[PDB]
Design a protein around this ligand. Sequence first.
Ligand SMILES: CO[C@@H]1[C@H](O)[C@H](n2cnc3c(=O)nc(N)[nH]c32)O[C@H]1COP(=O)(O)OP(=O)(O)OP(=O)(O)O
Ligand SMILES: [Mg+2]
Ligand SMILES: [Zn+2]
Ligand SMILES: [Zn+2]
Ligand SMILES: [Zn+2]
Ligand SMILES: [Zn+2]
Ligand SMILES: [Zn+2]
Ligand SMILES: [Zn+2]
Lengths: 93, 44, 8, 82, 87, 576, 257, 49, 98, 45, 67, 115, 479
Amino acid sequence: YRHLALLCDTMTCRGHLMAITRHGVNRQDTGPLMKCSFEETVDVLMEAAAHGESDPMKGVSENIMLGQLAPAGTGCFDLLLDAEKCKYGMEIP
Amino acid sequence: MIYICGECHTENEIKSRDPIRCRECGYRIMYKKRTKRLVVFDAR
Amino acid sequence: IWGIGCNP
Amino acid sequence: QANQKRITTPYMTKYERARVLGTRALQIAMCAPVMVELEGETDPLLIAMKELKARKIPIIIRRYLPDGSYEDWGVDELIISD
Amino acid sequence: SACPLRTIKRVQFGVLSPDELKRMSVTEGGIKYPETTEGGRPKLGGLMDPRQGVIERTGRCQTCAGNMTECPGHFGHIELAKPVFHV
Amino acid sequence: SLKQRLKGKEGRVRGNLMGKRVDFSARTVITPDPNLSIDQVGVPRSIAANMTFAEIVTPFNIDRLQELVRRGNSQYPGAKYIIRDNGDRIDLRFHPKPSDLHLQTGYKVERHMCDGDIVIFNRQPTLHKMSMMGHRVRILPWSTFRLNLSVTTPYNADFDGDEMNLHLPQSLETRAEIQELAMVPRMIVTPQSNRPVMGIVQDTLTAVRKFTKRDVFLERGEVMNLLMFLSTWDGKVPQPAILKPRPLWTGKQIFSLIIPGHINCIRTHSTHPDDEDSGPYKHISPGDTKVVVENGELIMGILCKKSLGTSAGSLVHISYLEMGHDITRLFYSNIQTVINNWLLIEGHTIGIGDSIADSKTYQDIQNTIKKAKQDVIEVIEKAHNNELEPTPGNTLRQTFENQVNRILNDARDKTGSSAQKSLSEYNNFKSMVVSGAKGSKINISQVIAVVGQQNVEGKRIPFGFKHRTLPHFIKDDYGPESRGFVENSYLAGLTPTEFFFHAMGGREGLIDTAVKTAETGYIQRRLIKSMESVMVKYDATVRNSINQVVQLRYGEDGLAGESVEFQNLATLKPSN
Amino acid sequence: PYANQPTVRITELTDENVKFIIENTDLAVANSIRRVFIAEVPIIAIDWVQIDANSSVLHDEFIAHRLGLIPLTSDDIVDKLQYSRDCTCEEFCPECSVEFTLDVRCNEDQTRHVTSRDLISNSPRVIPVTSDDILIVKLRKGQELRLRAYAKKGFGKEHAKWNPTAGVAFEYDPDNALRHTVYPKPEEWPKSEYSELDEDESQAPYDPNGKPERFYYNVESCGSLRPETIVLSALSGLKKKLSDLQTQLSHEIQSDV
Amino acid sequence: FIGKIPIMLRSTYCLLNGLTDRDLCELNECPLDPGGYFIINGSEKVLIA
Amino acid sequence: DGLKYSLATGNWGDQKKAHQARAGVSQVLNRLTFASTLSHLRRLNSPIGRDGKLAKPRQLHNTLWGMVCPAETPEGHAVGLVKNLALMAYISVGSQPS
Amino acid sequence: TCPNHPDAILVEDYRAGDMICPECGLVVGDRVIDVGSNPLLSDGD
Amino acid sequence: MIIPVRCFTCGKIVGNKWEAYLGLLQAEYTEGDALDALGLKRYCCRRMLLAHVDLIEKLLNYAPLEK
Amino acid sequence: MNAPPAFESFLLFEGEKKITINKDTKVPNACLFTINKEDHTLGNIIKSQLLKDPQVLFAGYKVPHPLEHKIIIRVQTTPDYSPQEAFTNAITDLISELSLLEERFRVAIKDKQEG
Amino acid sequence: EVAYCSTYTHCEIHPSMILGVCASIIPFPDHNQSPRNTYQSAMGKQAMGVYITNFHVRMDTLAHVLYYPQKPLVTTRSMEYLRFRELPAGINSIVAIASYTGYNQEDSVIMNRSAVDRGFFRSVFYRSYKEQESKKGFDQEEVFEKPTRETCQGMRHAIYDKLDDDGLIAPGVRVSGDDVIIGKTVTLPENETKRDCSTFLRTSETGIVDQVMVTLNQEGYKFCKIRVRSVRIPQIGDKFASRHGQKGTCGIQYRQEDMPFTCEGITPDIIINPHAIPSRMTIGHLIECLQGKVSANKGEIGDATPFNDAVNVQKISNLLSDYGYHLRGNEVLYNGFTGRKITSQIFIGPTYYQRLKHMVDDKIHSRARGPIQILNRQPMEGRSRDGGLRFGEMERDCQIAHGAAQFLRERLFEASDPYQVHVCNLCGIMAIANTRTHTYECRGCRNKTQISLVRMPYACKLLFQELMSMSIAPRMMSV
RNA sequence: UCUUCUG
Ligand SMILES: CO[C@@H]1[C@H](O)[C@H](n2cnc3c(=O)nc(N)[nH]c32)O[C@H]1COP(=O)(O)OP(=O)(O)OP(=O)(O)O
Ligand SMILES: [Mg+2]
Ligand SMILES: [Zn+2]
Ligand SMILES: [Zn+2]
Ligand SMILES: [Zn+2]
Ligand SMILES: [Zn+2]
Ligand SMILES: [Zn+2]
Ligand SMILES: [Zn+2]
């Protein structure tokens, strides 16, 4: 039921029925590059250029296009080195 | 550099940049002769 | 290939 | 965020375990000092697994909440998903 | 190489200004020659401009020492005599 | 044009950015290998030699990498390149100076792929997440990728010319990602249907049914050989079920050693009589159905598709849910090895003797067909006299077709049931259908009794010629044979008109397959594009890229789909 | 804890066939002997071909394959011959090989059938089982085949060209009494040639105490070896394999302790 | 002379028409070859109906 | 050149104009096996587009009894759009009506 | 142009597409083959 | 193209029997009788001689490449 | 192209041991013998003769992979008996059986001919 | 009879004539499922056999000819008019429908290695390479000669020793992969000597040259065709199919000793899984095995015309009962490894099996740091060009579902097209950058200080530049 | 740019 409910929730989240088509998906206010990957492509890019839209770069597809690490799993978090723990313990090598 | 001829099966030596025509028949389809070096075939 | 309710 | 008022899950997520073990193994391959005594373990990934079991990996995970704040959980503090 | 490594956090889309196009293009005075070849191979102010990009996989473009890999290419500009609608 | 380049598929936006051709990938035909474990894949030596995984030189591994460098590209466990600290790459094939071969910490030796290297295995189309799983590499001396038979069900791959793609991760970080997220044992259970993806299949399922029958008794030496292929054996021979007159083990006794740990499960065999549960002998089952496993020991029951297959509550599903993924991987492999080595003793076959039935059964099938044709004739005569009354909401033509189809379908099913009665215990068609490995009751019925009605576009065979199906039949013939009913079985052989009608039905099947592939591909892509960025944040809210809250908790209860199980509330139904 | 003492009766012995019954033996030993017949009895067969001229319709590797499959008499010389790997000399020498040479050209209008008789051996003992003939290739007028070949010792585990036998027939329990095979309908199955039952009874009554014994054999030869010699050589070779295992096992046992 | 028309093999206007099988062998053409294809630019092309 | 071009390319028309050209005619003969050669010579190609997935032109029709093989059709994106003549079928060459 | 080998002829390679110094094996130029890629009639048009 | 030496299944030499099989067929023996006379008993061996198609004669019809 | 040479099935490559004896930690008085470059031929005879021995509690043979050439034989004996001793005695018994069979087959051959 | 029609105007000559050329070779077609007959029609086109008797004269690309074709033991009467007897494609094989070791599972097939050694399903693959000496160039002449590394400035390090003086390798010389079949040289205009123009063997061909021919083509230029022959012993990847739609690869090859054996000593040449038959309902395969057993024993080729009414399974079974075998065709089998009788009796009989053109050697490909495309600087495509396999959009969606972000990044950026660009901080547009000069400047701002290095796929750089050429500005700003 | 196969 989780997988069915998620699709139903994404389609009806905005308050208007969002068809899973170029029209419904591309009308939502996502990033222009993410819209570009789905169907319309160049037309979406032209409109975004005309209106001065900025891509937040929070999407998975947008990060994949630019070669950056995706915000998906294993990319949600940023690891940091722990100096105090490095000092502790037996540093054999 | 000995070419066997298709039509009359007579070997004719042809130098480099020489027309490919067999003497004694005039055919223009030549075959290079089997190499002298020998290949070992496993019966397998 | 079976019937009308089955498969062709 | 402050050290208090941590709302994220105490258990280490599977993706965190994957990335922590991989990163620590890459460090071990680059001749980083190893906290856990190795019993003839040469493969960096296996040594990283041993360290994770001993909770001696020197990495602190920064979890970004959707509001923009971050909570810094050390690998030791997180409960291993295993 | 001295420039710090950065990751794009925002991509801003806008129509290119004609003045910015003039300044940015390495070609000066526009592409005056339809022919791509002058002096045998290279035609300055032509379609195949040495400054515009690396040619023949061994040459270096005039603007930077690309060696067919480092150079990303550089844009050129054509000054249309009379304006034309963009489709 | 620029827009033409970007817009279309295989353009820069999609064909070169979203997907692209990659290095360190290999592809070849796949062939079975029962001996390989679930996670292992068999890689040919040439594919392994071309593909290289760079290893950083450490003080721990400098000696091993030095030996690999000395071997070079020619000897198989060799190194193709040396990458120095400066980034200089020393290709070992062309002669390197003996000075260059020397290694120091920080160098990266590109060793050939060796046994135990984690790789990602793919088969197009990649419909679901289980179609890309991480496999350990085992090098074997032929030119085909070799994967275990249980792993075929997730990939939807059979070994009839299929091919798969092999991608080798090139860094320790990505290798660890694959090892801890995408390995085959970790993805035994799908979150889609909270069921196990992989199950015992083909020979092993068919033979596990026979192995687990009450009849099977194994002597001492056969037990020795079977235990030899059990990887998790404690080394202690179980006490035989029949100590005297001659020590004889039972199939269930040996399979209990395969069962991992202490797993408790109750399932029912496919042939379980419905009345058995209510009546006596409910626990002492007369037919040896009602599989029960207590303390990881098979007390009773005949294993089948329901017990060891890809369904909820299966023994494999309970193993993954209770024991863990590693022990479950061992469980799959051990079932396959031990049962496949018993199958050498027992054996399986399919012959014409299976298709043939008793003479009495053939006469019964023929009589059913005779009376069915008579009934269709009576319906036709009623329709011609206009005595037939239209069914509400249907025209007289539609109601005539409904009644004729009902008569023909009832006859078809009755003939099939007679054929299925005729089947003996030894019949191998029945073995495969009962075990669930392959086939169905319908296929047995068509093989032995009646192929059935041929329907095209949901109706009987239409009048392609003017008012008649084929030129041989008379105009305005609505009888059974004319409109497509195939009385003969496959064994008996179809008469020529029935052959053509059967061809028409099969053509409809082929066309449906071809159409469904394309339409379903489009639907799948659109769904993914619509929901690609939705994920569970650390608030455990489910948000898209814009950070709009799709759901406050995932699935409204914040639980993952693989962990959940079917359960009964038991407070709902009972009376006050 | 000791080996059973087997017996042998030879029912038939012909030039190409030996039928014998081994009694008081385990099934594993009997099956292993059958297996050694097929795969581990050494024979001399052609393994090296250098073709000087081949104008025949069949290509060179075709001719090499056909030549390899031709049986060569190896009754006594095979024991004397050493494996090419054992011989110290480089490549092939008379101690480690036998040289066959074939030269045939068709000058007559009639088709010339190149047969095994045209193979000529330097060693008299090894001949292509000629003393019709196996057809290597057919030659049209103006087509010539000249080749030189060397024959090496080997056994069938390497290649089927070194398989001494045509068909080894192995059967035990001719009337099913140990119920090793469970007939669904006992009556339909044809009775074995060795069956001792009357026509009325299809199967012998089940004997729980009985174990497989009195194994029936029928060994047929390709002419490379005498059919008796195949059996004797197989027994000797299996004995040698076990003795080599024993030597290596003694080495390992002593080294560990 | 107004041009050249490609000739389908073993048709009436082909050289192979009405030739005994021995003669076809003499021309190094198979007796069993069906014909019905054009040899255009050295490759045999078949006009699908 | 016109005849040779139209045969070699597989486009039915002129060199300058490809708008009205019909591709798919004049394929290279398959010589994997004699059966492949024979079937390639006796082949019918329905003009309906492969891209269209409408199933009516693909289904086997009752009128194909004895004229076209019921079983032999390519399986894939051209199911039922490529057909092979039956053994006894003979296409009419044509005659004057006078 | 091997830096350690003045005037060294670099052998071409087809497997990876690079010119390699034959006496030391150093790869000079990483992926510098790529694909590596009627003038008679008329002229430039 | 030519009769195989050594029937595939068992390995009995069957290459020497093709011309004798053809001759027995000319002598009006039935194919089964000819196979029995040649000594081929197992159906694997009889398959070789019964199903063989001698294409090498058809190939020999063509004139030699070199005379 | 990746096909192994045919001689690899029975020829030990240099540095390979025909027999390697490794003890089994799980159960007392059990040893696991690995035979390289051997097949079911030797393994079945050895296992059968071992099973005939009253002091051998367990005896089985396994080919780990058909493409590879190796036999693994597990022998477990009662205390006061050693698995290695059982293996040696099995080989001696098999050799004795084969020698007796050779003598009797030679006698049968000689009797069948001219008798 | 009972009156159905008394006005028949025509009669069919024979109902089996409804089938075409490829479907006529199917034995007992009426006993199979319809999709299976359709599949066999396609598989029979891809089978191997002597395509034509003049194959020696012909120089064709991709010609396969089987060593020992055999005519079917169970044949249709209409096959005679198809000339299938004259030019058969396939070998009758003793086939056992049994589960032996699990290597025949799914559709795979266990094959007898000893039979394979004796010539079973062995084939030859001929590949012809054509090259034309073109002198049409104004100053370019593609002369046939043996290129010399010293003389030719352009050359390759593959083996050139094979080439003779004419630049054409002599027939009878073994050619391994990446060897020069034909050596050709284009004279180089000295704008101010030689760019190598030899032709190289397809990788892993590993064949021996069969024929080399030198002629003049239609254009009159010298034309050279070279045919390379490679024998193809069946392997554990090759695809074999019967005439009833059952296709499968060879799972493993067991020697004659290991294969199960009847009491007579007959070991199956091919073992097929019993699981293939029931779902596919190809009973024609079983009836063909029974009729083949009867035919091999009787000595007469069996008749398998589709619609006969004189040939029934019961009649074939009685005929087989006469010849001493079980009437349904089952035979008691013995296990090759242990010798024990298999408890179930295995169905063994001769069946015509074919060998399809699809072989593992032609279909195996591996790529690792190979050449890249010019336009995208991405790996090439195709086995011939050492191309990498495509990581499609469906594959990237699977990886997203996994959560393996770094493997996705490696596969989609680092493995395929890594690249670095320099981007102005003030304006997102890329800036000119001279690494060797160490001076980095941005046009349009007259700013040198504010430039940042950005790592992006080369395809993404190309996308942004193509957007710029359309007057769209994709200003990537690090901030 | 085409056609033909393989899933
Ligand atoms: C079982 O499903 C598979 C997959 O879905 C994949 N596949 C195959 N062709 C296509 C295609 O054109 N387009 C897409 N997207 N996928 C495709 O192939 C399907 C089956 O096809 P089949 O029905 O022929 O499999 P047999 O039942 O025939 O197997 P036998 O007995 O021969 O081994
Ligand atoms: Mg498949
Ligand atoms: Zn001449
Ligand atoms: Zn530049
Ligand atoms: Zn010697
Ligand atoms: Zn150098
Ligand atoms: Zn035989
Ligand atoms: Zn700027």
